[PDB]
Amino acid sequence: DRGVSTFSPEGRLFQVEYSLEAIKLGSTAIGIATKEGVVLGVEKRATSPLLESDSIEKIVEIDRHIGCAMSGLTADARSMIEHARTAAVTHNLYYDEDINVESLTQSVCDLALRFMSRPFGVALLIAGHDADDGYQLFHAEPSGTFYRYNAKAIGSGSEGAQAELLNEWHSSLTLKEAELLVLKILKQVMEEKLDENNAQLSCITKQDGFKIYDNEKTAELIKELKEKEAAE
Amino acid sequence: GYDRALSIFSPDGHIFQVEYALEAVKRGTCAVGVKGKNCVVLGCERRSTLKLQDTRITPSKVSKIDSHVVLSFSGLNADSRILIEKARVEAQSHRLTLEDPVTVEYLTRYVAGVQQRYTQSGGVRPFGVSTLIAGFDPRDDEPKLYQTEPSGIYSSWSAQTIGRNSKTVREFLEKNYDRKEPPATVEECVKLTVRSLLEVVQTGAKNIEITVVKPDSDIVALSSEEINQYVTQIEQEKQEQ
Amino acid sequence: MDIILGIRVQDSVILASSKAVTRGISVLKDSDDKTRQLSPHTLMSFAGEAGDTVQFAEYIQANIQLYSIREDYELSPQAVSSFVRQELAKSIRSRRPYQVNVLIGGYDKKKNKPELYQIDYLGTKVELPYGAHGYSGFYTFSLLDHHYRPDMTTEEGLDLLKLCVQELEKRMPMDFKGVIVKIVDKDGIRQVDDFQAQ
Amino acid sequence: MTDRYSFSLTTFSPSGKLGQIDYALTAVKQGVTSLGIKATNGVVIATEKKSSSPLAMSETLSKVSLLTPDIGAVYSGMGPDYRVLVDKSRKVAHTSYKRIYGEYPPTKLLVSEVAKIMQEATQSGGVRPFGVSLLIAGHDEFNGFSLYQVDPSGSYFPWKATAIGKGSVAAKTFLEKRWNDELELEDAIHIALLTLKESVEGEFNGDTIELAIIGDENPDLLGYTGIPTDKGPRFRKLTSQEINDRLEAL
Amino acid sequence: TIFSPEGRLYQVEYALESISHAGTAIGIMASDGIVLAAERKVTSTLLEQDTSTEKLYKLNDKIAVAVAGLTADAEILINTARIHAQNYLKTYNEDIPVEILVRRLSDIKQGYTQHGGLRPFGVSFIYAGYDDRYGYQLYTSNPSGNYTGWKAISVGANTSAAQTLLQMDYKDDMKVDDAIELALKTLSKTTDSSALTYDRLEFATIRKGANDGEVYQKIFKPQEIKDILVKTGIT
Amino acid sequence: AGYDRHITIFSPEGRLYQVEYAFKATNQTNINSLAVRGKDCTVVISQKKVPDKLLDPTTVSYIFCISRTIGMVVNGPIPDARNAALRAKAEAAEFRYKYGYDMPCDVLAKRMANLSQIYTQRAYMRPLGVILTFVSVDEELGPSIYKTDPAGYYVGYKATATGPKQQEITTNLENHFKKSKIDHINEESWEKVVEFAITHMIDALGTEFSKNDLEVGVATKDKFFTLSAENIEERLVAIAEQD
Amino acid sequence: FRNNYDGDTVTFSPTGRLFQVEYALEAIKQGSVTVGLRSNTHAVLVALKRNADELSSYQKKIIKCDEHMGLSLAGLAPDARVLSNYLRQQCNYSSLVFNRKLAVERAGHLLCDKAQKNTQSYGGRPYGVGLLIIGYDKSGAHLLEFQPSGNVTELYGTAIGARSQGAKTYLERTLDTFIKIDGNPDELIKAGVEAISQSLRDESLTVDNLSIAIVGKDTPFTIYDGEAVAKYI
Amino acid sequence: SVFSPDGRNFQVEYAVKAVENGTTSIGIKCNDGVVFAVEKLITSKLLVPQKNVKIQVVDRHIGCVYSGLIPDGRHLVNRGREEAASFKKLYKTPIPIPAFADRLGQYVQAHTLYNSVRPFGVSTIFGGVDKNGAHLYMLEPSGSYWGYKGAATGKGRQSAKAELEKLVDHHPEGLSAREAVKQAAKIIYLAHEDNKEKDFELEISWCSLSETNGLHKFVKGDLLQEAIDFAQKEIN
Amino acid sequence: QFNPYGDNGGTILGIAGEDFAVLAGDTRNITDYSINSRYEPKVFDCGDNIVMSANGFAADGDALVKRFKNSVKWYHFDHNDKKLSINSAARNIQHLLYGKRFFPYYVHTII
């Protein structure tokens, strides 16, 4: 207990390390990056059955080609989203084109550095498409570091989720396979039974952009998963 | 230039100032809100340190933000005046620039936003306040109820309660409130509200206060007597062996 | 010059405002409302420089509505008109003054009197039985000096305005495209939405 | 460089004390005793000129200071704190009052202003309270003669007579015994000299005593004639010679 | 200005603790006026009582306050409240409604509670005033920035004792002269002095001014308190 | 350790430890100075110690020419001494520009005293570990000595001394003025006043001085100057053929 | 003795040490390994990137600064961004105002001065990254080592990060060989690849594992990753 | 901004330790100039010889060398340079050495006044030729400085100081610039005795009225070898 | 009074083909009736296969081209060496010019 930007004897930033702890307590978020698209799924985790589930916005659009899932202290994510949107629209204003997914992420991570009194208590999975590098997935920590992943999971269930993502991911996953896998791996790590109300799916395709799946299209895949896993 | 960081992380990943802000909320008098088919009802309680109070002039717990939205709070009363002022200023500012009154969701997002900012700025403490915000969007009939807390998280609720002994009343509401059937009458929606408050308050005398919001800026407070008509109907009739 | 008239009768206040909006060599609109409701019993009419006119009215409106919602109470016409005056008197010495003249017509419920306040862009306030801004005043003040009585009914006040408008149609150089008329009494604010061909 | 202590150094303790103000009062207690007595046609303020070695020139140190032509001040506690307060008080008598109304402030209001400056050091960031208590004596056309005490907290109160510092308890008692609401000025000077004989250890003469009155207008202390509508300053430092003459018949 | 694990504000709680040692002030509200009574802290014979003011301050012509706490801290707050009232009058050509002025002072207090790392003011106020919306009003504010409205209330020393007595003897249809009596009687039983005398009291009334229809502020002089002490049977 | 030991807040006894520690710092250089007044001059003397042989002895000084008319001697470490020197120089030039006459000795003392007083009160500034003795022949007051310390204190002196053996020198002077019955040295030439000053310095320190163990500043009507080694040597010769 | 003396950067220990700065220095030892070496015609960076998972990227560790200059990082990556950005500006300012390519030596002095301020201002923190700076200017090829303490040194070769001592040892002995690899880029790169190897208990350096950057006499600064580096494994 | 109970400033005191811990460096005054010299520890064979210049010029006529934290030294010189520029701009003439000394003095001293700044961890030896002679100065972390005939700071300061003391005593007539350069090479070699776990490079600079026209210049090539040789001679 | 503007003459021409473009200019630079230079180029390669001329007041023209070249350099830095498309360059040049709406670059610019 001495300062905010203080170094530990092991050369880590105290507050940055403790923010990482907050993220571990967050609802689970999973992302899978394929050649047909990128999928983002989350665990709603209502703290009570009276909470209206569809008012839980843990997947948010940034630009038509860029979406993002969060985990941790989700309130801290507000000004990152806002800043992300401004960066993407501003880029289109100055350059008459879509911002690169890596540039958008780098910008959010720039914001992350500006500690503002404390680091953010939230990590973000940023997914989208651009002409140059195709379908991409990014993990953005409140350290200002970001990482590209073929697949990634963040939140309380992430240790087991990552392990499962390690077995199941290969460079030829179809989008529909990838959707099923996100749903499956969420079902395993969620402290509740996965249905269309406590889990949300979304993806970005080159052609259709970023779409949040409504509860009806999700429920179908849940039903399709229960069956794909009955026969086997 | 005082910017000494007060809201910081602890080794287990908790922001203790935000946490103790929640403690101040749970210390505050209870507030509840429940939404009907064509309405939303907000209910509060009063304390008993002294009862030589003048009730005409003492700040009521339900505040009008615009003519179609209201805010009630649990926690530090002084803190809530500040959140209400800003919400009032924003409501006028949204009308001025967008030529429409706020949606309940938008006003909620704004207030939650202000709370959040206070969790990460130097030399400020979080708000010792959690809020229930209720009303109807302009030209819309579907009722709206939202809750914010000192962290800046916000969400919508079929029904919700906050403050001292809210654990108890959330218990009651969870068994009684049917997702299938919301209290279709204004009347029976005020019923579920007074019942839920009776567990905590004692006699629903000079302590329980109620406010009803209908669409198109229709907002009526109740009187002691019209409350007493609900206190009476449940005690005697739901006393049956 | 746009036409902004106000007449205070015994039980109400009536405001008549020209419907034309002219930029250059074109009448762009013949149905403009040069009025903002400030509260249920207070109405402001405005004329002057193009953009300043609405920006000011709507800023005054925002402030009064805010006050109402904060106090669950309506400010008196005397109070609102003092707010507006001070706002203009501030503006006159700033980097770019608001070039707007106003009439404030309200019904004070505490007093049960109707009230008419005339305020120009400099922040000059006065209470009058009848008022006007711009050139139109050069015709109406004398006309009303003759025909006005302090104890007229609202129906009588509307006949007094009819004279005023007809006079302005005979003698004013520009086609102001008729007037919108509004009444502020004990029951609030209403529009006589049928003044033109009547 | 830059002020990096932006918070209050005087805070509340769990018992409701404000530590630094208490400790400042403790500092005042160590201070050399000083007193003021309000008569019917004047006010007197007095203190001891505690010399440090006889090589120091006692006259060159101001313990009693003119604030306005009608107002004086004396203190107990930390001299350097008094000296800067006298400067800021003189200046504020001008900026806040004479430059606005064209006349010097009434005593209660100048006192109000010193009180403000001292309160501020009780609450501002990175500062400690002043370690002094002041005694301010003055006259104005509408309130007549007055006497006030200002403390480290910025509290002030009016007194008919009082003392502060080392031997304050002993002297307050002595004055209570001797004060009546019909005293002439020369009577109050005499009582002041008696009360001050207790405090003091060593020599007791006009060169170890600083004493000033607020009395009648002194036309010969104006510096000019011709505007008959002021007769001049009511404040008047007594000379070493004047103190001794009253000490012989003491 | 930080939170305890319990959810209370250290410096505030300690400030209220500070106030509990201050001379008691009472406000009582009648049907036709408000009484302000306050007790001076362990005083002296030599203390000037004539030109003395320390507990009762006029805010404008329609509103007075009684102070319990740090006298100097209250001087700051009184001055900026006086200014706010004049700002309101200048802006609107109407005297400030009591509630509004009370809210503003409380909001100032609340600030020190939440930001800046300065200490709160060690002050509580009883506000007595009149406006044409709500008539006579009695309010209270403390260093937390909290304000509430009262039929009768006390602040400073011995509020528990004093509060019990006011509830026992107050009844809605009171007249001002009975409220004066009640104020003095309550202070008689909660004092720490042998008995209550004139040089230890500050007294003020906000009446309807005999025959006029206009509001009057009276701050009782020494000799006037001495007299009103005789009539009630305390001599 | 309590904060009342590190910053200038009060201690329960009503004390300021940082100020007290700053007084201690004044003796760190282990040098004594004294100042006396003539009929129409003012003289300051200070021991001069050059331990290290590698030092250039002409640059080792604790006397400062503040203005044409005002000299200052410091008792304390040099960095702090030079800080106060530069500030006083700046203040004395500013005064003349703003007010059209030379800053008097006591007024500059007061101004420096006030500057020190601030450090006494504000937490982010440490006091300066110095005592400053200001001297001049003032146009209104004649020979003048005014001395300020880290507390914000200042006063005028008939004569004075500062340093480790302060009290010894003080009483030595006190004793002279008790017997002489006047408040100055009754000599016309400044050379005899310097001679007096060195002599009483010798008799209270129990030490003999060569020309390099001293430092002399003299203030006359409209000039303050320091003496060279050789002028001091010639002064030491005249005291030899007498005392 | 180690107690209240590591609170901030604005505090000396009784030994005369600045612990916060020492701790920031420690973030480098924990960082992934990178190597730098030069002859008289070219300068080379070789950076072994680190991954988080088998599914993650090998975070890029080489940043271009101008056409004639660039750097490799080991430590806090965000801090490499702050400083290299500042270097991009100083290079840019040199080009615009003076039509002058900025001297590597001046770049070193500038980085030193920027890091220094953070070892002395309250409420700030030292930079938590070490940097290897290569460049080609009017005096030839150059390599510099940046330490977050503000210490910069010009060298023929060096290495920083995890187990850097291995590569630094190899380089101390291969000195007279590589310094003479003039007008032959590929051999100098190879000598860099073989230098980085003496610092791997880890494993075989692979296709996505390796990063190479080069600048030289008629070669502007260019980073090679993946396909282009395959011929060096 | 903290006095310890003995009147010293404990943060300055710890700064001194950091200096004592540094490479040894010296300055020698001669009869028409000043010479400067420093010990450059050869951390590794990989250091480029002659290429990690420690000595720095200020304006055109002032030399600066230091021991301690090298970044702290560079910060000081940067400031010295602005203080030189600012002086020349206003007064035309280049800054006299005593004047330049007080400029660094006050600045270094300022960093001992406030609790939010730490003092400098260097002692700096600097000087040059101005309108009336050569001047040598050394400035300690407290801001204390004086003029010197000879000066040394760093790990081998004591052995170096003893050598300097010998020269002063055995050359009351004054030393020559040419000579002081050789002598400085000797002294750094002698001083390396108290730091010999590493190999070292010698660096020398000078500012002489007749040998450089009163401008600061580095000692390179022929003259640098003659100095190394002379120093190698009186160690075998 | 100081006039911040001048006019250095010259003339630029751009033609686009099916799979090429040309941008041409004369090399003459003038002031009033004097010739400053017979060969001062004002058409520049800006990298990323874009040529640019900013004709009119040559001081303003040079500042603009300088700024666009720099804009290209930073585009490469900030956006992973992406090629700047001609439409993107154009839009960027709009912003450069409009930043000086109230103290304009007196140039007709063609890319």
From Swiss-Prot, chain C:
It comes from Saccharomyces cerevisiae (strain ATCC 204508 / S288c) (Baker's yeast). Transmembrane segments: none annotated. InterPro entries: Ntn_hydrolases_N, Proteasome_beta2, Proteasome_bsu_CS, Proteasome_sua/b, Proteasome_suB-type. The modification N-acetylmethionine is found at residue 1. The gene is PRE1. GO terms for cellular component: cytosol; endoplasmic reticulum membrane; nucleus; proteasome complex; proteasome core complex, beta-subunit complex. Keywords: Acetylation, Cytoplasm, Nucleus, Phosphoprotein, Proteasome. This is Proteasome subunit beta type-4. The keyword Zinc does not apply. The 26S proteasome consists of a 20S proteasome core and two 19S regulatory subunits. The 20S proteasome core is composed of 28 subunits that are arranged in four stacked rings, resulting in a barrel-shaped structure. The two end rings are each formed by seven alpha subunits, and the two central rings are each formed by seven beta subunits. The catalytic chamber with the active sites is on the inside of the barrel. Pfam families: Proteasome. SUPFAM superfamilies: N-terminal nucleophile aminohydrolases (Ntn hydrolases). Gene3D superfamilies: Glutamine Phosphoribosylpyrophosphate, subunit 1, domain 1. CDD domains: proteasome_beta_type_2. Belongs to the peptidase T1B family. The modification Phosphoserine is found at residue 76. Present with 21800 molecules/cell in log phase SD medium. One of its GO terms (molecular function) is endopeptidase activator activity. It is found in: Cytoplasm; Nucleus. One of its GO terms (biological process) is proteasome-mediated ubiquitin-dependent protein catabolic process.
UniProtKB/Swiss-Prot annotation, chain F:
Keywords: Acetylation, Cytoplasm, Isopeptide bond, Nucleus, Phosphoprotein, Proteasome, Ubl conjugation. One of its GO terms (cellular component) is proteasome core complex, alpha-subunit complex. InterPro entries: Ntn_hydrolases_N, Proteasome_alpha, Proteasome_alpha-type, Proteasome_asu_N, Proteasome_sua/b, Proteasome_subunit_alpha6. GO terms for biological process: proteasomal ubiquitin-independent protein catabolic process; proteasome-mediated ubiquitin-dependent protein catabolic process. PROSITE patterns: PROTEASOME_ALPHA_1 (PS00388), PROTEASOME_ALPHA_2 (PS51475). The keyword Zinc-finger does not apply. The proteasome degrades poly-ubiquitinated proteins in the cytoplasm and in the nucleus. It is essential for the regulated turnover of proteins and for the removal of misfolded proteins. The proteasome is a multicatalytic proteinase complex that is characterized by its ability to cleave peptides with Arg, Phe, Tyr, Leu, and Glu adjacent to the leaving group at neutral or slightly basic pH. It has an ATP-dependent proteolytic activity. Present with 15200 molecules/cell in log phase SD medium. This is Proteasome subunit alpha type-1. It comes from Saccharomyces cerevisiae (strain ATCC 204508 / S288c) (Baker's yeast). The lineage of its organism: Eukaryota, Fungi, Dikarya, Ascomycota, Saccharomycotina.
From Swiss-Prot, chain G:
Keywords: Cytoplasm, Isopeptide bond, Nucleus, Phosphoprotein, Proteasome, Ubl conjugation. Belongs to the peptidase T1A family. GO terms for biological process: proteasomal ubiquitin-independent protein catabolic process; proteasome-mediated ubiquitin-dependent protein catabolic process. This is Proteasome subunit alpha type-6. It comes from the Eukaryota. Present with 7210 molecules/cell in log phase SD medium. SUPFAM superfamilies: N-terminal nucleophile aminohydrolases (Ntn hydrolases) (SSF56235). Gene3D superfamilies: Glutamine Phosphoribosylpyrophosphate, subunit 1, domain 1 (3.60.20.10). The modification Phosphoserine is found at residue 13. SMART domains: Proteasome_A_N. The lineage of its organism: Eukaryota, Fungi, Dikarya, Ascomycota, Saccharomycotina. The keyword Nucleus applies. It comes from Saccharomyces cerevisiae (strain ATCC 204508 / S288c). The keyword Phosphoprotein applies. The 26S proteasome consists of a 20S proteasome core and two 19S regulatory subunits. The 20S proteasome core is composed of 28 subunits that are arranged in four stacked rings, resulting in a barrel-shaped structure. The two end rings are each formed by seven alpha subunits, and the two central rings are each formed by seven beta subunits. The catalytic chamber with the active sites is on the inside of the barrel. There is a cross-link at residue 190 (Glycyl lysine isopeptide (Lys-Gly) (interchain with G-Cter in ubiquitin)). Pfam families: Proteasome (PF00227), Proteasome_A_N (PF10584). GO terms for cellular component: nucleus; proteasome complex; proteasome core complex, alpha-subunit complex; proteasome storage granule. Disulfide bonds: none annotated. It is found in: Cytoplasm; Nucleus.
Swiss-Prot record, chain H:
Keywords: Acetylation, Cytoplasm, Nucleus, Proteasome. It comes from the Eukaryota. One of its GO terms (molecular function) is mRNA binding. It is found in: Cytoplasm; Nucleus. One of its GO terms (cellular component) is proteasome storage granule. Its main location: cytoplasm. The alpha and beta forms are probably products of the same gene with different post-translational modifications. Transmembrane segments: none annotated. GO terms for biological process: proteasomal ubiquitin-independent protein catabolic process; proteasome-mediated ubiquitin-dependent protein catabolic process. The 26S proteasome consists of a 20S proteasome core and two 19S regulatory subunits. The 20S proteasome core is composed of 28 subunits that are arranged in four stacked rings, resulting in a barrel-shaped structure. The two end rings are each formed by seven alpha subunits, and the two central rings are each formed by seven beta subunits. The catalytic chamber with the active sites is on the inside of the barrel. Belongs to the peptidase T1A family. Present with 12000 molecules/cell in log phase SD medium. This is Probable proteasome subunit alpha type-7. It comes from Saccharomyces cerevisiae (strain ATCC 204508 / S288c) (Baker's yeast). The chain holds residues 13 to 248 of 288 of the full protein.
